[PDB]
Structures are given as structure tokens and as C-alpha cells.
Scaffold this motif. Structure first.
Motif, PDB file in Angstrom:
ATOM      1  N   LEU A  71       8.907   2.885   4.776  1.00  0.00           N
ATOM      2  CA  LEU A  71       8.012   3.187   3.505  1.00  0.00           C
ATOM      3  C   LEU A  71       6.500   4.158   3.897  1.00  0.00           C
ATOM      4  CD1 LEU A  71       8.188   0.197   1.113  1.00  0.00           C
ATOM      5  CD2 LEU A  71       9.139   2.157   1.117  1.00  0.00           C
ATOM      6  N   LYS A  72       6.171   3.696   4.996  1.00  0.00           N
ATOM      7  CA  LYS A  72       5.000   4.741   5.625  1.00  0.00           C
ATOM      8  C   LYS A  72       5.493   5.964   5.715  1.00  0.00           C
ATOM      9  CE  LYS A  72       3.684   3.983   9.747  1.00  0.00           C
ATOM     10  NZ  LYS A  72       3.975   5.572  10.303  1.00  0.00           N
ATOM     11  N   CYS A  73       6.600   6.240   6.352  1.00  0.00           N
ATOM     12  CA  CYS A  73       7.085   7.493   6.553  1.00  0.00           C
ATOM     13  C   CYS A  73       7.287   8.248   5.413  1.00  0.00           C
ATOM     14  CB  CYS A  73       8.528   7.278   7.362  1.00  0.00           C
ATOM     15  SG  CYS A  73       9.483   9.138   7.002  1.00  0.00           S
ATOM     16  N   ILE A  74       7.725   7.598   4.236  1.00  0.00           N
ATOM     17  CA  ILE A  74       8.125   8.193   3.009  1.00  0.00           C
ATOM     18  C   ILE A  74       6.729   8.831   2.481  1.00  0.00           C
ATOM     19  CG2 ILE A  74       8.802   7.878   0.656  1.00  0.00           C
ATOM     20  CD1 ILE A  74      10.821   6.028   1.774  1.00  0.00           C
ATOM     21  N   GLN A 129       3.913   9.458   4.011  1.00  0.00           N
ATOM     22  CA  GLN A 129       3.361  10.474   4.828  1.00  0.00           C
ATOM     23  C   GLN A 129       3.963  11.669   4.646  1.00  0.00           C
ATOM     24  OE1 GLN A 129       3.917   8.883   8.773  1.00  0.00           O
ATOM     25  NE2 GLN A 129       1.925   7.926   9.040  1.00  0.00           N
ATOM     26  N   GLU A 130       5.338  11.609   4.555  1.00  0.00           N
ATOM     27  CA  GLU A 130       6.119  12.719   4.048  1.00  0.00           C
ATOM     28  C   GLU A 130       5.671  13.597   2.837  1.00  0.00           C
ATOM     29  OE1 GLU A 130       7.154  14.565   6.512  1.00  0.00           O
ATOM     30  OE2 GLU A 130       6.741  12.829   7.751  1.00  0.00           O
ATOM     31  N   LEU A 131       5.602  12.766   1.649  1.00  0.00           N
ATOM     32  CA  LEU A 131       5.481  13.063   0.469  1.00  0.00           C
ATOM     33  C   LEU A 131       3.798  13.744   0.352  1.00  0.00           C
ATOM     34  CD1 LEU A 131       6.853  10.225  -1.562  1.00  0.00           C
ATOM     35  CD2 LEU A 131       7.525  12.431  -1.747  1.00  0.00           C
ATOM     36  N   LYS A 132       3.030  13.272   1.179  1.00  0.00           N
ATOM     37  CA  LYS A 132       1.579  13.910   1.407  1.00  0.00           C
ATOM     38  C   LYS A 132       1.658  15.237   1.797  1.00  0.00           C
ATOM     39  CE  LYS A 132      -1.246   9.631   2.279  1.00  0.00           C
ATOM     40  NZ  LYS A 132      -2.107   8.994   3.373  1.00  0.00           N
ATOM     41  N   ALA A 133       2.663  15.371   2.731  1.00  0.00           N
ATOM     42  CA  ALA A 133       2.758  16.856   3.286  1.00  0.00           C
ATOM     43  C   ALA A 133       3.269  17.702   2.299  1.00  0.00           C
ATOM     44  CB  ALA A 133       3.737  16.761   4.534  1.00  0.00           C
ATOM     45  N   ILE A 134       4.441  16.985   1.536  1.00  0.00           N
ATOM     46  CA  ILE A 134       5.144  17.791   0.715  1.00  0.00           C
ATOM     47  C   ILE A 134       4.256  18.251  -0.652  1.00  0.00           C
ATOM     48  CG2 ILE A 134       6.744  17.847  -1.339  1.00  0.00           C
ATOM     49  CD1 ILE A 134       8.549  15.664   0.549  1.00  0.00           C
ATOM     50  N   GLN A 150      14.180  10.279   6.647  1.00  0.00           N
ATOM     51  CA  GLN A 150      14.598  11.292   7.230  1.00  0.00           C
ATOM     52  C   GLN A 150      14.600  12.602   6.652  1.00  0.00           C
ATOM     53  OE1 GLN A 150      18.233   9.982   8.908  1.00  0.00           O
ATOM     54  NE2 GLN A 150      17.225   9.079  10.827  1.00  0.00           N
ATOM     55  N   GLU A 151      15.330  12.770   5.256  1.00  0.00           N
ATOM     56  CA  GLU A 151      15.326  13.679   4.281  1.00  0.00           C
ATOM     57  C   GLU A 151      14.175  14.254   3.883  1.00  0.00           C
ATOM     58  OE1 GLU A 151      18.266  15.317   4.420  1.00  0.00           O
ATOM     59  OE2 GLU A 151      19.189  13.685   5.489  1.00  0.00           O
ATOM     60  N   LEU A 152      13.253  13.231   3.711  1.00  0.00           N
ATOM     61  CA  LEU A 152      11.832  13.829   3.220  1.00  0.00           C
ATOM     62  C   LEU A 152      11.085  14.877   4.447  1.00  0.00           C
ATOM     63  CD1 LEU A 152      10.825  10.812   1.088  1.00  0.00           C
ATOM     64  CD2 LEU A 152      11.104  13.173   0.449  1.00  0.00           C
ATOM     65  N   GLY A 193       0.931  -1.086   0.016  1.00  0.00           N
ATOM     66  CA  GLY A 193       0.103   0.042  -0.147  1.00  0.00           C
ATOM     67  C   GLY A 193       0.986   1.304  -0.065  1.00  0.00           C
ATOM     68  N   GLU A 194       2.158   1.203   0.554  1.00  0.00           N
ATOM     69  CA  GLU A 194       3.056   2.444   0.483  1.00  0.00           C
ATOM     70  C   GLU A 194       3.479   2.842  -0.654  1.00  0.00           C
ATOM     71  OE1 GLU A 194       3.907  -0.582   2.547  1.00  0.00           O
ATOM     72  OE2 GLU A 194       3.459   0.009   4.503  1.00  0.00           O
ATOM     73  N   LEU A 195       3.748   1.851  -1.486  1.00  0.00           N
ATOM     74  CA  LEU A 195       4.262   2.162  -2.962  1.00  0.00           C
ATOM     75  C   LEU A 195       3.231   2.908  -3.601  1.00  0.00           C
ATOM     76  CD1 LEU A 195       6.872  -0.563  -3.869  1.00  0.00           C
ATOM     77  CD2 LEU A 195       7.095   1.944  -3.086  1.00  0.00           C
TER      78      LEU A 195
END
Lengths: 30, 28, 30, 28, 28, 30
Positions: free
Chosen positions: B3-6, B8-13, C8-10, A1-3
Motif C-alpha cells: 500500500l505504501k508503494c502504491i 508512492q508510485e501514484l504520487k510520481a504518476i 509493480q505495475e504502478l 494513511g496509505e489509502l
């Protein structure tokens, strides 16, 4: 789901950057 | 949970870029 | 280790874009 | 097909940022 | 080495965005 | 092949953001 999420959000990001690019051009054209 | 973090952060971006885009809409 | 860095960077990137967004709004408000 | 999508969208993102960069070149 | 590259480039991206943010701080 | 592309495009993105950053600084310096 993450991708899937990552793909979807990058689509949104590309969209907004195009909007920003077009707005810059419009601003420059007066 | 990276991957979950990535995700979430992209959503914010995406959210912040939309805000920036709508600002530029103003002032032509 | 790479995925942790990417996460972290994101986080940092999201942070700076929020800063930029708030600064634009502040500029527009005079 | 998620990785392909990510690649494609990043291509678009790079393209738009180049456009923005060349705009800034103008107006010093 | 792709993941390492991605990490490194994102570091650079974060750095440049901070620079841009601090510029905007100036000029209100 | 996808990860290579992602790496390559992020390189381009970092490049353009540096350009934008330098242009902002130049603009601020008059």
C-alpha cells in the motif's frame, strides 16, 4: 494513511488528465 | 509495504502528468 | 500476490509516464 | 470513504482518457 | 476476484503506456 | 461494491489507452 494518500493522488491524476483533455481540444480548435 | 508503494508510485504518476499538462499549455 | 502485482505495475506506469514527459519536453525544445 | 473516493476518481480518469482518445481519432 | 482484475488491468495499462512512450521516442 | 467499480473503471482506462496507442501509431505511419 496509505489509502488516504491513494485517494488524494488519484484526485490529482484526474485533475491533470482533464487539463490535458482540454488542451487537446483547444489545440484541435486551432 | 504494498500500500505504501502504491501511494508512492501514484504520487510520481501525478507529478509526471502535471509536467505533461504544462507542456500542452505551451504550444496552445 | 495481487497487491504486489499492483505495486509493480504502478512502478512501470510511473516509469513510462516519466519517459513520455521527457519526450514532450524534448519535442518542445526543438 | 477512501475506497469510494478511489472509485469516483477512476471514473473521472476513464472519462478524460476517452475524451483524449476521441481527439486523437480526429487528425487521424 | 477484484484484486486480480485490478492487477491484470494495470498490466495492460503499463503495456499501452510503453507503446505510447516508444512512439514519442520516434519523431524526437 | 467499491472494488468492483475500481476493477470496472480500470478496464475502461486500459481500453482508452490502447485506443490512444493505436492512434499514435496510425499518426506516425502517415
Amino acid at each position: 494513511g496509505e489509502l488516504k494518500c491513494i485517494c488524494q493522488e488519484l484526485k490529482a491524476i484526474a485533475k491533470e488528465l482533464k487539463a490535458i483533455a482540454w488542451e487537446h481540444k483547444a489545440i484541435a480548435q486551432g
